[PDB]
């Protein structure tokens, strides 16, 4: 469907604004390989956008790992805490966010990451995340399930004042679960997937781009870059 104008933007964090998915990947690969299993792209495609416990359970079930979701979360989080602060902004992220800010376009963050993980990941980036109108995290009491459940995006949209119609919201996502959550919420979505994701999982979004650098805001009725 052709892109329609929007007034409010909602961003994913992991893999979209920050390069944190590579950190998850290295840690889960190390754990999976102990058990002679490969933490592969098909598995990643299932768990990106999920809350930590949800993701862990899926990894365990799909790869048949001999652990509980609680054990996998505890171990992986212990390892990830050491490296989360090294997260870096993705290409085009700063340019876009600063542009939206200048033009007073409301935008917010909607991430399945919990509080502690968010705090660690954003250690070097507090000035960037301070530009968001508001932030909804995965441990928000209003949000029961991770993506592809639409609740995190619905909750995020409802916290703008005044709240927009969902159809005037534009989501930015790197993950197929996030694309599905946006569509289920009645929102348009720009996907910026890793090119290793399958064709089937990267042909559902309103627009699919190789980089945020390629996003043309005017396509959605927003101001062009200066
Ligand atoms: Mg993501």
From Swiss-Prot:
EC number(s): the record gives: 3.1.3.96
Could you confirm whether the keyword Protein biosynthesis appears in this record? no
The induction annotation reads: Inhibited by low concentrations of calcium.
- Needed co-factor(s): Mg(2+)
Annotated Mg(2+) binding lies at 12, 14
Establish whether keyword Transport is in the entry: no
Alphabetical GO CC annotations of the entry are: cytosol
Q: Which UniProt keywords apply?
A: Hydrolase, Magnesium, Metal-binding, Nucleotide metabolism
User: Which reactions are catalysed by this chain?
Assistant: psi-UMP + H2O = pseudouridine + phosphate
The active site lies at 12 (nucleophile), 14 (proton donor)
Task: Return the Pfam families for the record.
Answer: HAD_2
**Function (record text):** Dephosphorylates pseudouridine 5'-phosphate, a potential intermediate in rRNA degradation. Pseudouridine is then excreted intact in urine.
Protein's UniProt name = Pseudouridine-5'-phosphatase
């Amino acid at each position: 469907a052709p892109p329609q104008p929007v007034t409010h933007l909602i961003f994913d964090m992991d893999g979209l604004l920050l390069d944190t998915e590579r950190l998850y990947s290295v840690v889960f690969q190390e754990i999976c390989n102990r058990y002679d299993k490969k933490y592969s792209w098909d598995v990643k495609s299932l768990v990106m956008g999920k809350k930590a416990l949800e993701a862990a359970q899926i990894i365990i079930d799909v790869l048949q790992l001999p652990m509980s979701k609680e054990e996998l979360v505890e171990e992986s989080q212990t390892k990830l805490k050491e490296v989360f602060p090294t997260a870096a902004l993705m290409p085009g992220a700063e340019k876009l966010i600063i542009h939206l800010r200048k033009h007073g376009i409301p935008f917010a963050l909607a991430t399945s990451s919990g509080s502690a993980s968010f705090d660690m990941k954003t250690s070097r980036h507090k000035e960037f995340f301070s530009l968001f109108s508001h932030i909804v995290l995965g441990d928000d009491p209003e949000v029961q399930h991770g993506k592809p459940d639409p609740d995190i995006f619905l909750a995020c949209a409802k916290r703008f004042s005044p709240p927009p119609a969902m159809e005037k919201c534009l989501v930015f996502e790197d993950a197929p679960n996030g694309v599905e959550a946006a569509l289920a919420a009645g929102m348009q979505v720009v996907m910026v997937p890793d090119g290793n994701l399958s064709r089937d999982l990267t042909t559902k979004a309103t627009l699919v781009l190789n980089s945020l650098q390629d996003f043309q805001p005017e396509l959605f009725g927003l101001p062009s870059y200066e």
